[PDB]
Write a protein that binds this ligand. Structure first.
Ligand SMILES: CC(=O)N[C@H]1[C@H](O[C@H]2C[C@@H](C(=O)NCCS(=O)(=O)O)N[C@@H]2CO)O[C@H](CO)[C@@H](OS(=O)(=O)O)[C@@H]1O
Length: 129
């Protein structure tokens, strides 16, 4: 599904992402925007054999199993295909596990590049959340 920015802002706020491990909502909307353009079916293969999956572009080397990644760990305990559904439940549960690591939200390249140190007001503007 391709989410509308406010539509996504409301689903994330409903699922407890606002303030999760100290990451305010706008951080989460900004990274989804730059990482997948809000598309849950986004896939991106990497030079190394892994693939990025979903709205948060979660990587198959460490978090999910796609059956074709060399030395994969599957920390979230899921098939990567579950990260591609219109229903964000599993993606959110795994994004939540990813930010508990020491690198926090800096695990996301697109957050580091387009959101870190920015004015993210605009990503939740007009959502009434
Ligand atoms: C969310 C998540 O899975 N984050 C992980 C991040 O995943 C990236 C790769 C990038 C990708 O686009 N890489 C480009 C490489 S290539 O295409 O040039 O091959 N798109 C994904 C999201 O930003 O990869 C790591 C290792 O570099 C991990 O850090 S870590 O140190 O925990 O493991 C983080 O776990």
């Amino acid at each position: 599904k391709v989410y509308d920015r406010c539509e996504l802002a409301r689903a994330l706020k409903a699922s407890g992402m606002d303030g999760y491990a100290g990451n305010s909502l706008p951080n989460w909307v900004c990274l989804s925007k730059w990482e997948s353009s809000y598309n849950t079916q986004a896939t991106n293969r990497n030079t190394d054999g892994s693939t990025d999956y979903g709205i948060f572009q979660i990587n198959s080397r460490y978090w999910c199993d796609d059956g074709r990644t060399p030395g994969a760990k599957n920390v979230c305990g899921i098939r990567c295909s579950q990260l591609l559904t219109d229903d964000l439940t599993v993606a959110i549960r795994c994004a939540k596990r990813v930010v508990l690591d020491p690198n926090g939200i800096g695990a996301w390249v697109a957050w580091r590049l387009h959101c870190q140190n920015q004015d993210l007001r605009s990503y939740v503007a007009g959502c009434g959340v």
